[PDB]
Short mmCIF file of C-alpha atoms and ligand atoms in Angstrom, two decimals:
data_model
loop_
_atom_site.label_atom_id
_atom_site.label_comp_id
_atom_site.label_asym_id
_atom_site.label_seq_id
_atom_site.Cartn_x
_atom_site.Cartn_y
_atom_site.Cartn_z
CA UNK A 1 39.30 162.75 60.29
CA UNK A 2 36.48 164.10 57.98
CA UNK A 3 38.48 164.00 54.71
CA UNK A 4 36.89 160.47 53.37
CA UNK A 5 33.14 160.41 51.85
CA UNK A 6 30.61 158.70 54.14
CA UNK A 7 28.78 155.97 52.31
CA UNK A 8 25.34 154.78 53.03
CA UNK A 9 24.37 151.24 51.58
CA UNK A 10 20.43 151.58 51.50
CA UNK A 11 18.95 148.32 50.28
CA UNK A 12 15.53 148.23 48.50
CA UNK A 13 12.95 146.03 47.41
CA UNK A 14 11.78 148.60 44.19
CA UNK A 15 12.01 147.07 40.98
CA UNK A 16 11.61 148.45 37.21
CA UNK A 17 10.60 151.79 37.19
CA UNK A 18 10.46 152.19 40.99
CA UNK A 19 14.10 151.58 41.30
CA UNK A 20 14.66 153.94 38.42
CA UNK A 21 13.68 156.47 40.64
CA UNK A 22 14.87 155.52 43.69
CA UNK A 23 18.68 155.92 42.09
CA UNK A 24 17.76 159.50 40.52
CA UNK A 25 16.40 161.03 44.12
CA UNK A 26 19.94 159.30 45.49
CA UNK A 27 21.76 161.14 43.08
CA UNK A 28 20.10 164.28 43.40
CA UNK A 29 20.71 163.86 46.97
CA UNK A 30 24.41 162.97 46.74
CA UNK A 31 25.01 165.99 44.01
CA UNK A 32 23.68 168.55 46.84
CA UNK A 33 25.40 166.90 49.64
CA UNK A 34 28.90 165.54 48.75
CA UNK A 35 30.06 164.14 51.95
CA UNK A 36 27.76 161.97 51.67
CA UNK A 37 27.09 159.06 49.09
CA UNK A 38 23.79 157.09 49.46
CA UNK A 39 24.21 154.09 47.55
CA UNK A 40 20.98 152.14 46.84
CA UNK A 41 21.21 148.50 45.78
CA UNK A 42 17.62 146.10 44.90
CA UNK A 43 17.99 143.45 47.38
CA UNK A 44 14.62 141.60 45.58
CA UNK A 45 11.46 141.46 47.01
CA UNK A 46 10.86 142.56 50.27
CA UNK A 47 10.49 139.34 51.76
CA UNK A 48 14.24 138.37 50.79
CA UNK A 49 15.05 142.37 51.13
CA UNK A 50 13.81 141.82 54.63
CA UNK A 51 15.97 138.06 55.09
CA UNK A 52 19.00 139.52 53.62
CA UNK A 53 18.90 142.87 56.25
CA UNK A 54 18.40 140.70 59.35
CA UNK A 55 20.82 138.17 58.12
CA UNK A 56 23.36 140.93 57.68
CA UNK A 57 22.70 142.69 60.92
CA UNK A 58 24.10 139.42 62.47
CA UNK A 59 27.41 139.58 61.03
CA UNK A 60 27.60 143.39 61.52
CA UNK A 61 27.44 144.03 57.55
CA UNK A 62 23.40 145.29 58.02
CA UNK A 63 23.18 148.50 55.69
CA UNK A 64 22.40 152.26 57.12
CA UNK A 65 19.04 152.18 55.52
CA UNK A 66 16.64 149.08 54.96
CA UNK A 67 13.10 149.24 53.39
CA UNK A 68 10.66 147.15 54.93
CA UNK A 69 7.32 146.32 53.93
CA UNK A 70 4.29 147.08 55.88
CA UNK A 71 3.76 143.73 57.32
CA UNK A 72 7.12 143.28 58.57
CA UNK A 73 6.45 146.74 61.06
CA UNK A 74 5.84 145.01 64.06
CA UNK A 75 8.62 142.35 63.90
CA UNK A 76 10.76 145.30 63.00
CA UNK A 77 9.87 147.19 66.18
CA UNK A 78 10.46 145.10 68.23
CA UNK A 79 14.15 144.18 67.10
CA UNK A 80 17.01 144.93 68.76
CA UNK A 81 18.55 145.63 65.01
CA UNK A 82 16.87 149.27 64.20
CA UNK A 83 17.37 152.41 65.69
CA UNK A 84 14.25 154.28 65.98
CA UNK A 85 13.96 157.01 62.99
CA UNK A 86 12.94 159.88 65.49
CA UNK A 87 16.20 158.67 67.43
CA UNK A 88 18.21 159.09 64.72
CA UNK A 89 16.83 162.90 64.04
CA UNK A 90 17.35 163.61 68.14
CA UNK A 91 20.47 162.14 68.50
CA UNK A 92 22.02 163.98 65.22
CA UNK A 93 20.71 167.20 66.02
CA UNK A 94 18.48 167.51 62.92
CA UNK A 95 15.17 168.76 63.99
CA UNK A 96 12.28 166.69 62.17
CA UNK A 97 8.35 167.38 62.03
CA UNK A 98 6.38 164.45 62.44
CA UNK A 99 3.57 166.26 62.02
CA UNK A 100 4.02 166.60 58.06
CA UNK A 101 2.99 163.21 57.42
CA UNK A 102 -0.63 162.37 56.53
CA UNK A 103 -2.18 160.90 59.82
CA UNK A 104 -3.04 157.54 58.56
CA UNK A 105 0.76 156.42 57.56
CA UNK A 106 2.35 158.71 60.74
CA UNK A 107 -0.01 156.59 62.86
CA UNK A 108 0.54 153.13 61.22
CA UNK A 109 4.39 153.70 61.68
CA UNK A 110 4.64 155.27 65.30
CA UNK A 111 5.64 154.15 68.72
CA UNK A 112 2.05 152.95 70.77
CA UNK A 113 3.50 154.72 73.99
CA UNK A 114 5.44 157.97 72.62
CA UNK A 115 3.62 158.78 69.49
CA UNK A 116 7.10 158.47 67.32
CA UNK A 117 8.08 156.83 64.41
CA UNK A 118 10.25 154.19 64.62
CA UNK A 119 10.31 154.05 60.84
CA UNK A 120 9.94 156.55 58.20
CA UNK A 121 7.11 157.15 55.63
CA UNK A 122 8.43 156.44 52.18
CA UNK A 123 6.30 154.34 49.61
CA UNK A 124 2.75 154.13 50.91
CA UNK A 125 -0.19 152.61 48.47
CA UNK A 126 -3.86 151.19 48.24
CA UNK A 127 -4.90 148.75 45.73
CA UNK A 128 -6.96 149.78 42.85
CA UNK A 129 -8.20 147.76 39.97
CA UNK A 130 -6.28 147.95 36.36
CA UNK A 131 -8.02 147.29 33.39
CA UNK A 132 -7.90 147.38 30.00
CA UNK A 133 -10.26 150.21 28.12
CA UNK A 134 -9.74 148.44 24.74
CA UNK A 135 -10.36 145.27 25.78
CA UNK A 136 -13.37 146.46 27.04
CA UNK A 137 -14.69 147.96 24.14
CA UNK A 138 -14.25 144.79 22.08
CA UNK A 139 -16.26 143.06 24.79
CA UNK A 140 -19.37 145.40 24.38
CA UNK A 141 -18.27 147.32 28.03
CA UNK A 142 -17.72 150.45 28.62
CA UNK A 143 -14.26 151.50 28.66
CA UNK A 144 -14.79 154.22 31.32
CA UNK A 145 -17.15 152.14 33.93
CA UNK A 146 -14.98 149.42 35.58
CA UNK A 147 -16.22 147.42 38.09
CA UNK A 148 -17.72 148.88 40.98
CA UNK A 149 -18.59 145.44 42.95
CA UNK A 150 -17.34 141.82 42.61
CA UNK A 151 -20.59 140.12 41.68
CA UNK A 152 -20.17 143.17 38.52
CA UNK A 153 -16.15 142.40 38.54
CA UNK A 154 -16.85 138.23 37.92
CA UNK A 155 -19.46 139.52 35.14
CA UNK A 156 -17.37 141.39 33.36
CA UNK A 157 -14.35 138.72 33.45
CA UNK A 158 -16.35 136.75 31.82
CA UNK A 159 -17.42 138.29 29.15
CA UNK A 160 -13.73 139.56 28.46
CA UNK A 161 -12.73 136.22 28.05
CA UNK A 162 -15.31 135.13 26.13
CA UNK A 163 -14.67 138.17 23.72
CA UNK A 164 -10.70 136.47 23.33
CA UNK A 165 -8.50 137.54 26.09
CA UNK A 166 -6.53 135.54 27.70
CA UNK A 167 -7.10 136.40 31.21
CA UNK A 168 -10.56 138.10 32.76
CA UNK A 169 -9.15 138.75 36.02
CA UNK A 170 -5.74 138.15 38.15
CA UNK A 171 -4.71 139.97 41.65
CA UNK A 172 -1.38 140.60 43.07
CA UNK A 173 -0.75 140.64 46.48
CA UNK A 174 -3.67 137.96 47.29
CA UNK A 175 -2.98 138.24 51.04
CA UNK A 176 -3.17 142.25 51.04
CA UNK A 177 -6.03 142.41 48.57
CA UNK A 178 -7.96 139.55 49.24
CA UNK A 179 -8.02 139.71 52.85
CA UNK A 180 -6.17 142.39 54.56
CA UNK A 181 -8.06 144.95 52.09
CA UNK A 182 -10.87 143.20 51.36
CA UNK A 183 -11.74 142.66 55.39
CA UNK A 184 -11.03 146.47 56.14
CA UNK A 185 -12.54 147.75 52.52
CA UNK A 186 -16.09 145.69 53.67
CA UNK A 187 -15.89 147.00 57.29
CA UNK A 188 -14.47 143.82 58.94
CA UNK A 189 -11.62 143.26 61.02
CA UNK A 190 -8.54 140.79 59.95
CA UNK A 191 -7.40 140.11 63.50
CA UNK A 192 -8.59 141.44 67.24
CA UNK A 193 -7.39 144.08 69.47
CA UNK A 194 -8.43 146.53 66.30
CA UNK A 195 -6.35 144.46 64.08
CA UNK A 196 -3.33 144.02 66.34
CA UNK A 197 -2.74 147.80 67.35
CA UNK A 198 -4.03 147.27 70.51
CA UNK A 199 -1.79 144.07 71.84
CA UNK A 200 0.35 141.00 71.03
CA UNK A 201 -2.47 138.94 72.46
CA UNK A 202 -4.46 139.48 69.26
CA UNK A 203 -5.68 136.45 67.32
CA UNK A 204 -6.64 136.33 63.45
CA UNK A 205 -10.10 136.87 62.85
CA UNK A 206 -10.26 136.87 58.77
CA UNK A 207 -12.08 132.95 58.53
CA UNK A 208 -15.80 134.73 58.57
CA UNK A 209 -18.51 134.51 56.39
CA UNK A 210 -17.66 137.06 54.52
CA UNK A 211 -14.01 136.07 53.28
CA UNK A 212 -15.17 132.70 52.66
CA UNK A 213 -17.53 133.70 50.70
CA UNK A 214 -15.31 136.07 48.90
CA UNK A 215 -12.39 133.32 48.27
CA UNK A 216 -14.96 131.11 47.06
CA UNK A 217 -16.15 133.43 44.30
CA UNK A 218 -12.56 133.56 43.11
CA UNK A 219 -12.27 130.47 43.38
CA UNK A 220 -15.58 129.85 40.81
CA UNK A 221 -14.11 132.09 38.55
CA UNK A 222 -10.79 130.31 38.56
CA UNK A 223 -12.71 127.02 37.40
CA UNK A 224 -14.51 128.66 34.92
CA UNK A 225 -11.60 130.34 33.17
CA UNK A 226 -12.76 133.86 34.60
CA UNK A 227 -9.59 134.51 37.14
CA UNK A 228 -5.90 133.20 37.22
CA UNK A 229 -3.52 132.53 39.77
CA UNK A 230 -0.28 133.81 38.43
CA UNK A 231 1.92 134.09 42.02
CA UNK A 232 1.78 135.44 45.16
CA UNK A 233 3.13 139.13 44.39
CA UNK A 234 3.30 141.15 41.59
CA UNK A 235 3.44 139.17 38.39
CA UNK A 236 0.00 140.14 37.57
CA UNK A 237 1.04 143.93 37.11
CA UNK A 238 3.56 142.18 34.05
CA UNK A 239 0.51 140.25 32.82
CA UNK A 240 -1.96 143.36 32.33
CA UNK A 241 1.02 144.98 30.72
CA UNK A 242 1.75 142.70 28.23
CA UNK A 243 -2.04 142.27 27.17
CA UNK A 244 -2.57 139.11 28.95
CA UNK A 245 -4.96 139.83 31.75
CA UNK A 246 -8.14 142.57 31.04
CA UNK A 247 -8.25 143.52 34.42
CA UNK A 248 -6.14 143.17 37.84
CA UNK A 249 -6.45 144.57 41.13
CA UNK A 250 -2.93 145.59 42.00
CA UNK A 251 -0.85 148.06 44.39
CA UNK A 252 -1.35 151.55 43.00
CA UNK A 253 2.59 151.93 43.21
CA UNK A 254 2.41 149.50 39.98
CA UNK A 255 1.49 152.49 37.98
CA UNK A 256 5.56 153.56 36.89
CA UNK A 257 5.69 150.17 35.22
CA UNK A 258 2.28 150.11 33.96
CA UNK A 259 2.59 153.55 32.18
CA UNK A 260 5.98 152.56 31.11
CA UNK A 261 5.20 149.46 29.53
CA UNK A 262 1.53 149.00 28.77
CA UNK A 263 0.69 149.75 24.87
CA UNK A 264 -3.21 150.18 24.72
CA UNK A 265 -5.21 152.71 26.95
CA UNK A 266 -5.94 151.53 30.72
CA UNK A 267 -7.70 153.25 33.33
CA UNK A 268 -7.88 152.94 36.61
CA UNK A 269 -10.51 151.82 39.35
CA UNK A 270 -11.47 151.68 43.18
CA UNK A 271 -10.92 147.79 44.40
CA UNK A 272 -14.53 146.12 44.05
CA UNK A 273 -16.50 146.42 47.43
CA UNK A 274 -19.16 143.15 48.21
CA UNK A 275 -22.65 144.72 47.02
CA UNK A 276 -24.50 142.81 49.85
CA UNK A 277 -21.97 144.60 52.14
CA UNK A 278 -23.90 147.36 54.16
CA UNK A 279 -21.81 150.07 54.92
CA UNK A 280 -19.33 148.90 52.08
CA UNK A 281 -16.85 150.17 51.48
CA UNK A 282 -15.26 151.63 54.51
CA UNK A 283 -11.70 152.71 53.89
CA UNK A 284 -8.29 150.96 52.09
CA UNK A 285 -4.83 150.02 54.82
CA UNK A 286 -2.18 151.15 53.43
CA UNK A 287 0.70 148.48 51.93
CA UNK A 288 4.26 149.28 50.63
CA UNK A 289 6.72 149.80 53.16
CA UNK A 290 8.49 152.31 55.08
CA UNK A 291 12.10 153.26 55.97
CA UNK A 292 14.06 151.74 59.03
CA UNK A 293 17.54 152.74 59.98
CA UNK A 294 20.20 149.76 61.27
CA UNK A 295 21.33 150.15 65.13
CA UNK A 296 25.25 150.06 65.27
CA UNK A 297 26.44 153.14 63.01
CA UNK A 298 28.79 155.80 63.09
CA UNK A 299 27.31 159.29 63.63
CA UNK A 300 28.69 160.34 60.44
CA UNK A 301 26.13 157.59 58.83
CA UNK A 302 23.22 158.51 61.13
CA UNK A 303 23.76 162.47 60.27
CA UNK A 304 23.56 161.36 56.25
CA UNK A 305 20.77 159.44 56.85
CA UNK A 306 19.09 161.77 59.05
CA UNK A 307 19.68 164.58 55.78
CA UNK A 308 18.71 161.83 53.24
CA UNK A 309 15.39 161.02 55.18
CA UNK A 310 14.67 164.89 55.38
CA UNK A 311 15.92 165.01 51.67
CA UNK A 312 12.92 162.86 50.96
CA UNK A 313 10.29 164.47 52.83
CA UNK A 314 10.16 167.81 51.12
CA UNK A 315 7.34 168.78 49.50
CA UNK A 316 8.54 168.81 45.93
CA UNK A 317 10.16 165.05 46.02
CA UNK A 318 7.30 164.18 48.03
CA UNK A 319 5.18 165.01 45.45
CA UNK A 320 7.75 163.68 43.05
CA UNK A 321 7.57 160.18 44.48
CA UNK A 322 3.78 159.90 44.39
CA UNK A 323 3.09 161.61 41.01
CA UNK A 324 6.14 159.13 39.18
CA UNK A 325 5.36 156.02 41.01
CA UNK A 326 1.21 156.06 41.83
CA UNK A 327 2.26 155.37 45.73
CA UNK A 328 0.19 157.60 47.53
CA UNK A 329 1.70 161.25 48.55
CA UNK A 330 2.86 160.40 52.10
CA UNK A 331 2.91 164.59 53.40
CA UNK A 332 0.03 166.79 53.52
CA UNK A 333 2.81 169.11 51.30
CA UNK A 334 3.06 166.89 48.97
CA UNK A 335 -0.75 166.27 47.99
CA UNK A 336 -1.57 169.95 48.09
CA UNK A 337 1.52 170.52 45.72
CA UNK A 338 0.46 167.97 43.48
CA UNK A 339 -3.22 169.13 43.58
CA UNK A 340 -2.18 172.53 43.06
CA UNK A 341 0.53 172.00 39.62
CA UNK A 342 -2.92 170.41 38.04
CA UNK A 343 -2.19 166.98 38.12
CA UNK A 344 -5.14 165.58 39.37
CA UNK A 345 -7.08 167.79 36.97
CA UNK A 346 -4.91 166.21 34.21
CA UNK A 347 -5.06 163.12 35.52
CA UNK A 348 -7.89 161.94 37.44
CA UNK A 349 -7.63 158.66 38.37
CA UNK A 350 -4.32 159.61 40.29
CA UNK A 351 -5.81 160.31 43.37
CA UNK A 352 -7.90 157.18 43.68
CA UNK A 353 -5.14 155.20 46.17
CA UNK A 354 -5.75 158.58 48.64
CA UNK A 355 -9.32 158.24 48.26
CA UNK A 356 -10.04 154.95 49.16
CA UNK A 357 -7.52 155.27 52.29
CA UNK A 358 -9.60 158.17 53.08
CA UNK A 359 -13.16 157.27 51.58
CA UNK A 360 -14.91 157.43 55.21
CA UNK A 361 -13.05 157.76 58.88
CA UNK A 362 -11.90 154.27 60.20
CA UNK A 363 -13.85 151.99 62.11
CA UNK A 364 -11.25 150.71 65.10
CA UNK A 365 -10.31 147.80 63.44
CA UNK A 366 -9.32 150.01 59.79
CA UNK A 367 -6.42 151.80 60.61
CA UNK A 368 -4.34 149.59 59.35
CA UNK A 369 -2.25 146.59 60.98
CA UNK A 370 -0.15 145.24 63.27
CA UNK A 371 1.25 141.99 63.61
CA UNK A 372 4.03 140.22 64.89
CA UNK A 373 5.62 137.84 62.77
CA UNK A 374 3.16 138.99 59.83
CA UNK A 375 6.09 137.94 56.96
CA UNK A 376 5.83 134.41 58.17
CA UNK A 377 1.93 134.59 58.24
CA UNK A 378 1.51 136.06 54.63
CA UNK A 379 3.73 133.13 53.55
CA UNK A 380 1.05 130.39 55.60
CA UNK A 381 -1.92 132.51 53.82
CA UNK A 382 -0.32 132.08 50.85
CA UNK A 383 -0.06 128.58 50.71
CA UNK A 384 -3.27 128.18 51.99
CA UNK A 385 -4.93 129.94 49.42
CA UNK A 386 -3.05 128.09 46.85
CA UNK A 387 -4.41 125.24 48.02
CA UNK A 388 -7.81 126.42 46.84
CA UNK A 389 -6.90 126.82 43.65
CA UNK A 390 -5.55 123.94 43.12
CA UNK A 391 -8.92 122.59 44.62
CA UNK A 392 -6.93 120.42 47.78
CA UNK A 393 -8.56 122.60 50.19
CA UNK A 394 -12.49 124.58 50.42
CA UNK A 395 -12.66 128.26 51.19
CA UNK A 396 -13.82 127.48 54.59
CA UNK A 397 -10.98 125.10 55.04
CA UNK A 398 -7.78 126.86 53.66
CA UNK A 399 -8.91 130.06 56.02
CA UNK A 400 -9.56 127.94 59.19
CA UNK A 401 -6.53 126.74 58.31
CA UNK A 402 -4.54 129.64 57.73
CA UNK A 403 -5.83 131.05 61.04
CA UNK A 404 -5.06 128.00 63.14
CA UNK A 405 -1.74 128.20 61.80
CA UNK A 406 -1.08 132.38 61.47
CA UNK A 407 -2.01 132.43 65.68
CA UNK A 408 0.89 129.87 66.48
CA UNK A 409 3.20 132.40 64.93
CA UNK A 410 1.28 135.02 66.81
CA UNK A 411 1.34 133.00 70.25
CA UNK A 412 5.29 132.42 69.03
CA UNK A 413 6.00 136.28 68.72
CA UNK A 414 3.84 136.86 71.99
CA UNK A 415 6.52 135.20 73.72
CA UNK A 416 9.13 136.11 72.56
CA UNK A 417 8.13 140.02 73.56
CA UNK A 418 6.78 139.38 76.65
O1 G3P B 501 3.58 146.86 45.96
P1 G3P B 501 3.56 147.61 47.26
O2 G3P B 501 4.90 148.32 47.45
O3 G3P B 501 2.40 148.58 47.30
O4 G3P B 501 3.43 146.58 48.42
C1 G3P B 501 2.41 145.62 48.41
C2 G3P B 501 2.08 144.99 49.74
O5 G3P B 501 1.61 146.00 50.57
C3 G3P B 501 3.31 144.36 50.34
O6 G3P B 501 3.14 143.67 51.54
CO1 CO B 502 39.36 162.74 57.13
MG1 MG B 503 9.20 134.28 66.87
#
């Protein structure tokens, strides 16, 4: 009757040091509230994080909490699997202040027509550029200018692999840097209705000029020697670690692994901005993911979670989170806490994810995105950009391409909706 310990399966995509930390905050959490046991388990990455919670909400298995990566918001929403995170608070009693959160990730995760969240804030990031401050002193650079624009980024690759390294330049994420980012960063939009906020009717709009342009420089430096595909997600953060690659532009929540594991002095950048770009840059969208809670529990579980979620919104683990991990603090607390302790006076780069989220107010089409059946359309972009370097496909082609394809599963989750 209330003698047995509620457990709460919360499945995650954070790996290495991100997962490292994930378990301590659980068992902080579980040592202060022992009726409750939040058990995280690493699903993989959050695409199969994401397959492996749907799949399970259709045999009734789905855990309490699931993290989901920005992209997958929309598809999430409207599901029939999640009960809404503001529900959750109401319906356990728990009061919860929205309010905390800094505007841009509140906004990117709340309801269009009641202002709630549907998901929780968690691990929110920007990309910024890693490189290597030894590597460029033995390549006659210096160690504390990185790149401000690509034209100066493909430059600089250059001569780092000329001066022996093995890599100039790699990217995780390609989709979220090279054209979710890179679109917002230079003031463009990556799909209509202000980048899907404003309607499922929106179409993608990321086959300009300007991206072509920008995956064909890439792709220059990839037959020269100057940049290397090395996969689709984060196995470039393991190949600036180890040495191999001088300089990638990577989420800033690859900093726990970085510091953990990288043996020479890096520093960190802004993500290069196009130099012909007026106006550039604008502002970063956010990536990581955020917290959803599975329909279909007892209120036992949804009372845990509710304390968990709460649990992870105060100001010191907050500020924790951000300052361990280089995602961005997700609370106004939480960056005035970690302003105020020092730490960006000790550390200066830390703040740069923040800054470039906030580096000037959003145009309409900056705020961030939404997209139905986005998971499926990073996978298309994906290929598609693969197919450049491998040469199959031009610039102009592979993005027409992706497009063409990337609205059919737009059309697809249009109707489905509707
Ligand atoms: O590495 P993360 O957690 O910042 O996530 C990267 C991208 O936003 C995922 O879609
Ligand atoms: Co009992
Ligand atoms: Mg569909």
């Amino acid at each position: 009757g209330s003698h047995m310990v509620t457990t709460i399966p919360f499945w995650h995509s954070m790996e290495g040091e991100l997962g490292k930390e994930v378990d301590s905050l659980a068992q902080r959490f579980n040592a202060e509230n022992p009726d409750y046991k939040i058990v995280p388990t690493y699903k993989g990455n959050y695409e199969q994080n994401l397959s492996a919670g749907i799949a399970a909400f259709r045999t009734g298995n789905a855990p309490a909490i699931l993290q989901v990566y920005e992209v997958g918001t929309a598809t999430m929403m409207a599901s029939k699997a999640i009960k809404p995170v503001y529900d959750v608070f109401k319906e356990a009693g728990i009061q919860f202040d929205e309010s905390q959160f800094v505007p841009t990730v509140s906004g990117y995760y709340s309801d269009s027509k009641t202002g709630h969240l549907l998901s929780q804030p968690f691990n929110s990031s920007t990309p910024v550029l890693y490189y290597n401050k030894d590597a460029f002193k033995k390549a006659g650079l210096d160690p504390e200018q990185p790149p401000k624009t690509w034209q100066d980024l493909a430059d600089y690759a250059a001569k780092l692999k000329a001066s022996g390294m093995k890599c100039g330049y790699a990217s995780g994420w390609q989709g979220w840097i090279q054209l979710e980012n890179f679109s917002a960063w230079n003031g463009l939009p990556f799909a209509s209705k202000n980048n899907g906020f404003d309607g499922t009717d929106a179409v993608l709009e990321f086959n300009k000029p300007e991206q072509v342009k920008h995956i064909a420089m890439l792709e220059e430096m990839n037959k020269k020697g100057d940049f290397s595909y090395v996969g689709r997600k984060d196995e470039s953060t393991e190949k600036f670690y180890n040495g191999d690659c001088a300089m990638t532009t990577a989420s800033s929540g690859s900093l726990a692994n970085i510091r953990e594991y990288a043996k020479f002095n890096y520093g960190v950048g802004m993500m290069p901005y196009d130099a012909d770009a007026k106006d550039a840059p604008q502002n970063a969208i956010i990536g990581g993911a955020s917290l959803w809670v599975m329909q279909g529990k007892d209120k036992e579980t949804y009372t845990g979670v509710a304390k968990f979620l709460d649990f992870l919104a105060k100001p010191e683990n907050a500020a924790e989170w951000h300052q361990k991990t280089g995602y961005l603090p997700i609370t106004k607390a939480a960056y005035d806490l970690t302003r105020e302790q020092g730490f960006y006076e000790k550390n200066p780069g830390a703040d740069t994810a923040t800054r470039q989220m906030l580096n000037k107010p959003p145009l309409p089409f900056t705020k961030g995105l939404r997209l139905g059946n986005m998971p499926q359309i990073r996978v298309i972009v994906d290929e598609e950009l693969e197919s450049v370097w491998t040469g199959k496909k031009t610039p102009q082609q592979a993005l027409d391409t992706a497009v063409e394809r990337g609205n059919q599963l737009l059309r697809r989750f249009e109707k489905s909706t509707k």
